[model samples]
Target chain A: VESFDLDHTKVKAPYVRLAGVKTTPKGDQISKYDLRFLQPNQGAIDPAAIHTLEHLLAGYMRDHLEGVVDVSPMGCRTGMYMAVIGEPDEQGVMKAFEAALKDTAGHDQPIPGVSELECGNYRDHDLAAARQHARDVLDQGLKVQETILLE
Target chain B: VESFDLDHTKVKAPYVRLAGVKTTPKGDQISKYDLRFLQPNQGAIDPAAIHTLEHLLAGYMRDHLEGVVDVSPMGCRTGMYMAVIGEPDEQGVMKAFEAALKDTAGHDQPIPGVSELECGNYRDHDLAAARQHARDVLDQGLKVQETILLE
Candidate 1:
C-alpha cells in the first residue's frame, strides 16, 4: 500500500529509502526499507537473477544485521523490501545491505534453499547473473534517498 | 523443518494433514497444515500453474477461513503449507480448502496480482492449468491423513 502511494516516476533507482515503520501494541517496532536496484520503466531485473539474489540475501543479510524478519523480492522486480525490528539509521542499514550485496557478488557455493526439496522453482536461478547484478548495483553506489540524484 | 522428518514415500496424495502446531509464549496457538495435492516423487506441479494457484489461493482462502497467516506452495510442488491461528479440525480445514479450490476452478477473471508492477514474473502463469489441476485434486477426493491409504 505504501509503495502504491509513492511517485515511482520521481524516484531514482539504486537507492535505499525508509518506506515505513510500524510499532506493535506491545512496543515492538518493525521498519521496512525499499532497496531499489534498477530504474523502473528503463530496465527490469531478470527473474532468475533476482530469485538467486533472494536466496543469497535471505541468508547473508541475517549474518550482517540483527532482528532481520525478511528480505523479500518486490513484485515489480525493481528491488527488494527489507523488514527488520526497530527503526535503524539509514546509513547503518545501507552498510549492512551493501555487505550483503558483496557477499552475494562473491558467493561460490551452491545456492542455498535450492533443489526440488527446498524451492518451488529451484531451476529458475542464475548465480552468474545474480553476481553480475550485485556488482553492477555496487558500482552504481547505493544512495540514501529515492529522489536524490547520483552526481 | 518438520516436513523433512515425514516419510514422503509413505504418504498418499490429496490429503489434509496437520503438520504441526505451535503455542506462543502468550498462549496464542498457530496451526500449520500440509495440503498435499500430488504424490511426491511421482509427479511435480508445473511452476506456472502452481504460481497462478498460489496467487488465487492466497486471496480466496482468506474469504473462507480466518486468521490465515499464509497458504504457500511447498518447494516439492506436491502441496501447500497453510498457517493459521488456532487449531481447527481437519474436516473443516478441508472444506474451506475445497471451497477455495472450487473458487479457483470456476474463476474466469484476469488472474490476480499479475502485471509487471504486481508480480516478479507475471508472464509465468497459467490460469487454465491451475484450474484443471484444482479440478483434478477435487476429483481425487481429499483424505484427512498423509500416510493413511485412500481406499
Candidate 2:
C-alpha cells in the first residue's frame, strides 16, 4: 500500500530515493529505498528480468553497500525496494546502488542462486535481460530524489 | 548463509520453526521463522506454485497474524521465511500460518497482485498449484520446533 498511495504518474525512472525510515518500538531503524528502473505506466520490467534483478542485486548490492537487509522486487514490476539498517544515508546508499547497478550490468559470470537446489523459480531468469536493464538504468543517470516530475 | 549452514538432511518437512532472532544494535528484535512446506531433497515447490504462494501469503498471513514484516520464499524452493517484529511466538506464528495456508488452499478469488501493472512476473502464477501445495503442506501437520528429525 505504501507504493499504491504514491502518485506514480509524476515520477521519472532510474532513481534511488529514500522512501522512509521506520523505527520499531525497540529502537531499531529500518530505512527503505525505492529503486525505480523503469518508467511507470510507460514500461515495466519483464517477469524473468525483474526476478533476475532481484537475485542479481540481492548479492551485488551487499558487495558495495553495508548493512543491506533485503532487495525485493516490487509487485508493480516497475522497480524494487531496498531495506537497510540504521538511519538514512541517501547519498551513500545511492552511490553504492549505482555501483551495484554497474556490477549487475557488467556481470559476466554465472547468475547467483539460479539452480533448482538454490532457487524457487530458477529457470525463468534472463541474465541478458538483467544486464541490459541494469545498463539502461545506469545510462539514464541515477537520480537520488524521492520524486522527479515528468518532463 | 543461514539455510546453507543448517543440516537440511536431518530436518522434517511441513513444519514451521523458529529459525533465529537478531537484535539490532538499537534493540529492535527480529524473529525469523522458517516455514518449510516441502521435504528437502525429496521435492521442491514448482516455480509458479512457490511464486503464487508468496503472493498469497503476502496478504493472507497478515490477515491472521500481527506485525508480519515479510514472507519470502526460500531460494531452495522447499519453504519460506517469515519475519516479524519482537520475540518469537512459534505457536502463535504456526497457528496463523496454518490458517493462512488454509485460506490459500480454499481461495477461489482472483490471485492478488497478478497483473502486468502489479506483479513483476504476473503470467507465471499457478493458482491450482498454489492451492494444492498449500493443502499438501497442511495435511502433513505443521510443527513449531527449530528442527524436526526425520522419523
Candidate 3:
C-alpha cells in the first residue's frame, strides 16, 4: 500500500501523464496515466464532451499501443485516465497522446461505438465540443512531466 | 508497456479489489483499487446511479482515509476505480471500503452535498439505485483480492 502522491488539485493540464507505473504482484506491467485537460475544482468538463473524448482517445490508444489496458474519464471531468500494461515512458506516451488529440482536433470524426443498438448510453456523443476540448489540451504543448511521480 | 492482465472479459462481480500498489517514480504513495459491482459487457451501470455513488463513496473515503487521492468510474461501467495514498495492504482497505459501501447500503439518509448549489450534477443523483447497487456488491462475500500486484 504505497500512497497516491498526486494531489490532482495541484495538477495542471496539456499532458500525457502517467499517474505512475506499477508491476503486478506477478511482476507483470500495469500503470495508469492522467490525460488531464483542466485543473480540478477550477472548472470541469462537460459530460457529453468528456464522453466523446473517451471514445476518440480510447480508440486511438487501442489501435496504436500494444498494451493499452483501460481508458476512462475522471468523474470530476478534469481529464481522462488510462491503464496501460508496461513501465511507462513519458516521451513516447506524450507523442502518441498528442497525435491522437491532434487527429481528433483536425477532423469532425464520427465517434466510434455510438448507437442505441451498440451502447447503453448511446446518444451522449458530442464530437465538435470534444474536438475543441482536445485542442485546448494540445495547445498547452503538454510539458509531459512524470506527473507528480516523475518529477 | 505491459498488458492489462485481468481479462476484463473474464471478470465477475461483488469484489473489493486493489488494482495495484505502487510507490511513485517520485517516491509518493499511490494505488488504484477496483470497486467492481456488476458483470461487464453483459450489462452496464446506470449513469445517474454511478454519479451518486461517486459522491457517496468519495465523500466517505476522504473522511475515512488519511490521504485520499482521486475516485472515479470505469468507462466500461462494471466498476469504479479509486486512487489513494497508502502502502499495499488488502485487509485494511477492504475493511474500510466494505464499511463505506455498507454504510451507504444501510442508510436511507439524505445524500450529502446534493443541493443545487453544492453539486455539479445535483438532480442527476439516484440514491435509492446507488444504495441497492452498494448492497449488491456487499452481498458478494467480497473477494478482497490484492488484485494483480498482490498475487
Candidate 4:
C-alpha cells in the first residue's frame, strides 16, 4: 500500500480529490473519501449525530453519488471515510462530498428517503451530533498534510 | 440490576407439563414453548441447513408439539436458547426436548428443508453443535441449587 501527502494551501484552484479507490480482481470496486473535521478530539463528535449522518450520507450517496457501488463508514479516529467503486475522478468525489455534507447539515429538515429499513436504526440518531460534525468539516474545508515518496 | 438465584429443582409436581406441541404465534397468545439452536463455533454452518431446520422443525413442531409460540435462533450469540412463555411446567419442557431430539436425529438422508436459503448466511445453522448441547442438557437434566436469603 502507498500513502499520498495532501497540502490544502498548495492547491491553486478549488478541487475535490478522490484519495482511496480500490478494485478487486473480480472487477469489484471500492472507494474511500476522507471528510476531515476540526474538533478538540475525535470524541467531540457525538455518536448519535454521526450515526444519523451515516444514514443520511449513505442514503444520499447511494442514490445521488455517480458510480457509487457501495458506501460504508470508516472506523478511523481522525476523520470520517467513505468507500465506493465506479469510474473514479476528483470531481465526482467533490460533488458527492458536497451533497453529503449538505444533507447531513440539514438533517432536521425533510429528507427524501430517510426511513427505517433504508437508514436502519434511525431512532438512535442524534441530529445535533451530526450537525456538529458537518459544521466542523465546513469550518476546516477538508485539510490534510502528508509526505509522498517515489521508489 | 440486582442478581438473584432461581431453584429449578424445587419446582413442584402436579404442574401442568405439556410437550411436543408447536403452534406459531399470530399476535399475543400466551406462548408455552419455543426452541432454537445456534451454529457450531468451528466452521461456519451453512445458511441453507439452518433455514431447512427452521422450516422442518416449524412443521414438525406444528404437527407434533402443542402450544409452541416462536422458534428462532438467538440473533447475537453462537448458542441458541428457546423461550417458552406459558404457565411454566417441567414435564412440558422435557417432553418437548425429547420430541425435538428424536425428530432432528431421525432426519439422516439428505435432510429435509436444506435449501440454498437455509444453507446461506442467515440460515446457516449447526445442528451437530446444537445436538451436542441438547445431549448435554438432557444427560445432566435441569438442576437448580437454592441459597438462603437473609434480610
Q: Report per-prediction Cα RMSD to one decimal.
A: 6.3, 4.8, 8.0, 19.5
Model 2: per-residue Cα lDDT at residue B22: 62
Candidate achieving higher lDDT, 1 or 2: 2
What lDDT would each prediction earn against the true structure? Answer: 0.72, 0.75, 0.66, 0.41
Model 4 lDDT at residue A115 = 40
Clash tally for model 2 = 2
Number of the candidate with higher DockQ, 1 or 3: 1
Query: Residues B9-44, candidate 3, lDDT per residue (tens digit)?
Result: 444566766675555444454566777777545566
lDDT of 4 by residue, B1-151 (tens): 0112212223221122222222212222122222323212222223333334454455455455554433432111222223242444545555655566566655554544343222112233456643444454445443222222222
Can you write out model 1's per-residue Cα lDDT over A1-151, one digit (the tens) per residue? 2123355556666888877655433445456688889875566666678778888997888888886655666545668777565564678788998999999999999998675444545667889998998999999999897433222
Candidate 4, position B60, lDDT: 55
Every model's DockQ: 0.14, 0.24, 0.13, 0.02
Model 4 compared with the native: what TM-score?
A: 0.38
lDDT of 1 by residue, B103-129 (tens): 999999999967655454566788999
Query: Which 10-residue span in candidate 1 chain A carries the lowest summed lDDT?
Result: A1-10
Candidate 3: stretches off by over 4 Å: A1-3, A146-151, B1-103, B106-151
Native-to-model Cα distance after best TM-score fit, residue B3 in candidate 2, in Å: 6.6
Model 3, span A1-110: residue lDDT tens: 22245544345565666675555444554566777777555677766777788778877776666556556786556678776656767777777787777877976657
Better of 3 and 4 by TM-score: 3
Q: What are the runs in model 2 whose C-alpha is more than 4 Å off?
A: A1-4, A7-10, A17-21, A40-52, A75-78, A112-126, A145-151, B1-4, B7-12, B17-20, B38-52, B73-79, B110-129, B144-151
**Higher-scoring candidate on DockQ, 1 or 2:** 2
Cα RMSD (Å) between model 4 and the true structure? Answer: 19.5
TM-scores, all candidates, are 0.63, 0.73, 0.60, 0.38
